[PDB]
Amino acid sequence: MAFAGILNDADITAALAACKAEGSFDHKAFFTKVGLAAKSPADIKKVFEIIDQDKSDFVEEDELKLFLQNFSAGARALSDAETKVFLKAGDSDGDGKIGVDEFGAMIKA
Ligand SMILES: [Ca+2]
Ligand SMILES: [Ca+2]
């Protein structure tokens, strides 16, 4: 909408419209679709502040809920299985959060 061309609002919206059905949680496709897998450290660090929608130096599940609204104004809030598989894409230590190093890993795959 009113964001930088670093991200394609349409691609964000696209995968988010798809990852709204339980069982259709291809969020890794989200990263590669929106172009997030082609981000530089600096970009990924502002994206850090996105999963940290609270800006608390830590990114918890409750943040991943509205973190998408912080990513894009017309984004969908992730559901049970959606947030789960999405988080675990990077969350390897299983602490219900996105460690930003876990994050870089999940985006890169
Ligand atoms: Ca936070
Ligand atoms: Ca973790």
Curated annotation (Swiss-Prot):
GO terms for molecular function: calcium ion binding. Residues 39-74, 78-109 form the EF-hand domain. The keyword Repeat applies. The modification N-acetylalanine is found at residue 2. Ca(2+) 2 binds at residues 91, 93, 95, 97, 102. Thermostable between pH 4.0-9.5. Average melting temperature (Tm) across all pH values is 60 degrees Celsius. Lower melting temperature in acidic pH 4.0-5.0. Keywords: Acetylation, Allergen, Calcium, Metal-binding, Muscle protein, Repeat. SUPFAM superfamilies: EF-hand. InterPro entries: EF-hand-dom_pair (IPR011992), EF_Hand_1_Ca_BS (IPR018247), EF_hand_dom (IPR002048), Parvalbumin (IPR008080). One of its GO terms (cellular component) is cytoplasm. Gene3D superfamilies: EF-hand. SMART domains: EFh. Ca(2+) 1 binds at residues 52, 54, 56, 58, 60, 63. In muscle, parvalbumin is thought to be involved in relaxation after contraction. It binds two calcium ions. Monomer. Belongs to the parvalbumin family. This is Parvalbumin beta 2. It comes from Gadus morhua (Atlantic cod). The lineage of its organism: Eukaryota, Metazoa, Chordata, Craniata, Vertebrata. The gene is pvalb2.
